[model samples]
Structures are given as structure tokens and as C-alpha cells.
Target: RPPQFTRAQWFAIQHISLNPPRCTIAMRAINNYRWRCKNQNTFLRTTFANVVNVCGNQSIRCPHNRTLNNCHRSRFRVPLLHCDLINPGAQNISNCRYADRPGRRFYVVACDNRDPRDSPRYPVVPVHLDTTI
Candidate 1:
């Protein structure tokens, strides 16, 4: 059968399709990370692949020749705790893991939640720490 709709008529239609939840997670990762030019392009290319797999194919070429497994997994933080601290008072050091193309490495932070009584002597407020990687 020949196409029924004219080009002008097709323009009036609003097409929609299912967006998989995994793709939303992918987008959030893209937004969360601070990306430079090369990495940003890499991220977009990876996202395009996900879209094609879930939503259907398009004319757009997959420009990224190498796998983006490292780019996607790199520095992705996962929350491991809530409303808790590694140490409650004084200076506390906590470890976080850094994952990139070069396997895993350690990242750390120091925090001090000062008591009200200690405020006069210490006179500094500690940075709020979220228990996460």
C-alpha cells in the first residue's frame, strides 16, 4: 500500500514511545558527573546506544568506536548508608571507592560534628557528609 498521509499531515502527529527505566538511570548518571568535552561526547554516544536498543533504531551512526564501559562505570557513586556516621564526634575519616577504566582506587573524607559545648573553642562547623560513595 502507498502512504496515506501527506508530509504536512504527518507533521501534525505527536508520536510517543516507551522509555525504559534503565535509560532514566543512564541519563541521571550523565547529568550527575562533571564531564569535559571528550567525556561528554562519549556519554552522549553511550546514551544513544541505550536509546536505540530500547526505543528502536534511528539513522544516527554510533560514532564511538571503543566500548564505553569504563566511561559509564567511572566515578558512579552508590549510597551505602543513611542517617549515620563512621564516627560521631571529633575528627572522623571515612573511605570511598573510586572506580574508573583503571580498576578501583580509594577516596576518603574527614568530618567533625562538633558538640554545642565545643563550639566556642573549635568555632567551625563541619561539612555535611552523606554516607555514600
Candidate 2:
């Protein structure tokens, strides 16, 4: 029963079993988009570009925009959005006190950046309508 598998086989299996963080995030985004609703009743817009000249090619150095002020170490081509949804004014959508939270509000949105590393908590295309009734 000793050494049933060779060292090379063990190493290969170990390496193959690892799952990258980006892959997991992408998978989650796909799942969220599939089950979430689409809020077509309102308007959403966004604009993003590499305005900062400090960064060139590296993801960690490229600048997203001038307003960002180089806060994040990672330089990403950010996509901005301006959404104006018709909120219900109060917490009437659900009995929960936090029904008015962004998650229960906007049903859809569109952002300029789709990179998973930009925002892990809020990942998805046309961002989720997290705020709106």
C-alpha cells in the first residue's frame, strides 16, 4: 500500500486540482447573470478609459482615470456607468428591513470594466441593478 502513486503523478494531480481565483470569480459572475433579473425600465450609462499616463502596459501600473488618484495598486481599464433607476422611495419591495439595499433595488446596469480583479464583491457585466425598487 506504500507509494501507490509515483511522485510525478502526485505532483500533476495536485497542480491540476488547483482553481485560480479569476476562474472562480468569472464562474460566479456567469451564475449571477443567469439568475438575475433585467431592469430595462430605467437608463444606465458609463464611460471609462486609461486617462492616467503613469501606467502603460502592466496591470499594476496602468491608470484607470484621473479621478481615481492612483488609490488601487492594480491599474485597470475601468468602465464607468451612470444609472438612473426609478426607486420605490422606501422599503416596500420586501418585508426585510434591508430590502432597500442596492441588491434589491436596481435590476441591471452596464459598466466599462469587466475585469474580475477590479471589484470582486460586485462582478458582472452591465453590473447588477443592486439599487432600485
Candidate 3:
């Protein structure tokens, strides 16, 4: 299966996998959020055990390690996996919880979507008018 093409004659190719509908929602959100960052405040993190996510059923956990309950491999687990952080900009988060990786993190506009009307003048003030009788 070798010698088909020389090293210099090599070409780059991109193959897009077809996922079930809505499976890419989380992935796209993270990517779009990253692109919209003005500074390097946002990014991605990694984990050995893939956590249960909105887009998936069973997660990518480890095997043999009893502490790693859901993280069992070779027992109906997927390998070479990647996914999005549920959140970022925190600390001391756990593995498979990709949100709060120490160095690597993701940033975003304070409000990803700002309503033109929701201004400082008309702020979202939750005033509790005491109606306790």
C-alpha cells in the first residue's frame, strides 16, 4: 500500500464526518464563541475521560480504574475523542469536566447575545415588592 505517491507529490485532504442532526450544536457554539473573542480569553481544554454531554449518550471513560467508573475502555467505549467544555473561566475543575482546565480555557463576550433594548438605563433589576401578608 506504499509508493502510490512520492512525499513531494502528496496532497492534503479534508474529510467531514456526518453526525446526527444537532450533534454539532455544542461543537459549533464553542468554535463560534472562540472566533468572536477580541483577545485570547477563550479557548478549549482536554480530558482523558469523555464526560456525558448533551450531544452524546455514553461518555468516553477509562477502564480498569475503579475510581474511573464511567471511564471504561474496550467495553463499548470510543477512542480518540474530543468535545466542548460545558463552561470555562473557573478553577479546580475535574478531568472530563473540560470547563475549568488550569491554563487552557475559553472566553466569550460577557453576553454572547445582547439585546439592543436591554441597556444600562433599563437594567434587569429584580425588585421584590414585599407582598407577604
Candidate 4:
């Protein structure tokens, strides 16, 4: 006979399976950001020059001192309360390169966090590999 899952266990499994893609894509975007910023100790909090950096140009401003949760809540249409900006163990990628059938490709997505005070923005940015220069 097959093992049966408890109600709570089933719920957890469902929750995990249905959960939206989080840091994987976010960090891939960040890795692309790091390529631009060239800083090794980068995270959501790391800053460069006069503007906050990540996802796009430093001139682009993010909400001051906001957490990943804040970004999820403010702009991401989907709920991402469970996501955090920590590197998962052994999951670090020096570069965002992934196979694309015939060849590899580098991925880039629109900047996720920009000044909410500013007018235009995307609903949610997808994480893509930066396989090209």
C-alpha cells in the first residue's frame, strides 16, 4: 500500500508545490546585477554610488531600506511573503548561464524594484540567465 499523507502534510506539500518561484529567479537577476555592479558581497541591502543597486542601473532608485517582502508586497502582484534574500546552500551561480537547447543563453529581465514613487513598473520580473556578454 502507498503511504498516506496527513492533512497537514498534504497541505504543506500543496503549499510548496503551488508556491511561486522566488529567490531562484530573483537571485539570477541579482547575479546579472552583480555582473553590472561587480561587487561580491551583494545582497538586497548592498548599495553603490548615490543610488541603491540591484536588478538594474544604480541611477534607478529602490524604496529605501525595504526588504524582499516589501518588494513582493508593493509591486509583485503575487504574494511572496515567504521569500527571503539569502543564498541557498550550494545554489550559488557565478554566472546566470543555462542551456537553451541549441546553445546557452543569458537572461535579463526588467528591473523589479524601482522607486514606487515613480510612475511606470512591471508586475513581476522573471529571473533569466545571462549567458551572453
Candidate 5:
């Protein structure tokens, strides 16, 4: 099963998904636990605080497709990075390339309702990225 992403972990995946700076596709390995081609993806440019803040503050409830739980969507757009596979491939883990679309978008996320008293960290845990739009 895919691990439920903590706020920090989720941010890192969306922050700098490309480790080597060009065509590495680290997000696939990070999320899917495999060195494989990631056909379509998105990364975040705003600080994690921005997302955390929206979790229950500027967010409105929505349905999460995976969790089927009430999730949240940002009231405003945030800086985003959209990456899609380029040239196509035969599922080669290495030498994969992607075309990038940089834009601002409304972020969707599922939050974990863990007790904040448990730790100062993960007060607003972001479980999954429900969508990128």
C-alpha cells in the first residue's frame, strides 16, 4: 500500500521532484516506490505553510476520490509545476524526459486528522494530493 504522506514528505515530493535537475522522475520512485516512467505529474512551488494554512483555513471541503473522505481545495491558486512524459518511451526508467507546464493552480489535498498534541510537527498533515488543477 502507498504510505500516507506526511506534510513534509508530501512537500518534498512536490517541491523538487527532479533530483538531477533534468529528466530524472524522482517523484515516481518517491511515491510509487519504483524507478519507472512517470507519465504525468505536478510539483508545488509555494511553501508547505501555504498548503498547511489552507487545510482548514482558506479551504473548502470536497470529496476525495481515493479516500472517499471530505477533503479540501484551496480557495485560490498556488504556483504549480506540471510535468508530462516527453517523446514517449518503452517504459525505460533511465533516459526518461518530460515536458513542463508551469502555472498557478488550485490545489487539492486530503488531510490527516491526527491529534496535534502528539507533536508540534504534522499539526496539519497532508495525506494525499487529490488533484492538480
Candidate 6:
């Protein structure tokens, strides 16, 4: 959320994490691509609409530091994945590993309050993510 990344960036982070399975290389790739030291990542597998819906369907608004924190939960329990980080440094993509404990989870995303006017594709966009019962 630095350098003024947009609401799309939040979804972008999840977008990478969303398309998951296989292993650590993906985690590595995203970290490498984003230039971040991401130690752990959670991926929720479901339709993009499902993700976007949380922002509107029975919306739950949580304010942290007076910023956009509108949270909504998944209508259905969805598949979940977690990605692992290789060595924090020295570029060890070749050795990165993924820790998979596959299961169904109720996920949620906090959509942004920016963009009073939105695009046709995403009327409300996600800015944060979380899990609930």
C-alpha cells in the first residue's frame, strides 16, 4: 500500500494469490515481480464476482485509521491456498517451497471507498482481505 497503489493493487495482490495451486515458484514470482518481501500469502479460489460481491452483499464496514475497510464475506466456503517464501534474500526461487493445507474457508475482502465513480468491470473494488467463520 505504499507509493500510492490503487484499489486495483489490493485486488492485484489477491489476483496473483487467487490463481494458485502447484507451489512456491508462484509465490516467488509474485514477490519477485512486485519487489516485496512477502513471507506468507493466502489465496482464496472463487469467482472474481464472488470476491467483489463481498463488498456489497451485506457489507461490513470496519474503519482502521479512518480509511476504507468495507468487509464482506464469501457466500460459500471456497478453496484456500497459502504460498511460502523462500530465503528472504539472495534470490532462492529455485528452492522456494509451498505449504499446502487444502480446505474450505469463508473468506472476505474489504473494498475501497475511493473512486466515487467506478468502471463497468468493478463497481466496488477490494482493498483488504480476511477470513471468518
- Winning candidate number (TM-score): 6
If both were scored by lDDT, which would come out higher, candidate 5 or candidate 6?
Answer: 5
lDDT for each residue of candidate 3 in 1-133, tens digit (9 for 90 to 100) = 0133221111100001122123123234323423321111112121211211211333332232334322211223222212334444423222113322122212110101113433343222111111100
Candidate 6 structure quality by residue, lDDT tens digits, 67-116: 53467767778777765554556344445565555567776677765464
lDDT of candidate 4 over 31-132, digit per residue (tens): 442323212211221111111112333222223333322221112222111223333333435533331111122212223433333324333231211112
TM-score of each: 0.15, 0.16, 0.16, 0.20, 0.67, 0.68
Question: Top model by lDDT, which number?
Answer: 5
Model 2 residue 39 distance off true place after TM-score fit, in angstroms? 18
> Of models 3 and 5, which has the larger lDDT?
5
| Local distance difference test, candidate 3 | 0.22
Candidate 2 local Cα displacement, residue 14, angstroms: 24
> Each model's C-alpha lDDT?
0.22, 0.24, 0.22, 0.26, 0.60, 0.60
TM-score of 3: 0.16
RMSD of each: 25.6, 17.2, 22.0, 18.1, 4.5, 4.0
What clash pairs does model 4 have? 106-129, 106-130, 106-131, 107-129, 107-130
Per-residue accuracy of model 2 over 24-107 as CA lDDT, tens digit each: 222222223223222222211112121112112223211323333312221332222221223324233221111111111211
Model 5 Cα lDDT, one tens digit per residue, 1-133:
2245545464456553323233244444543554566677677666666666667754445544853554678888877677777746636556666777777888787767644333466476565677866
> At residue 41, what lDDT does model 6 achieve?
68
TM-score of 5: 0.67
What local lDDT does model 6 show for residue 125? 75
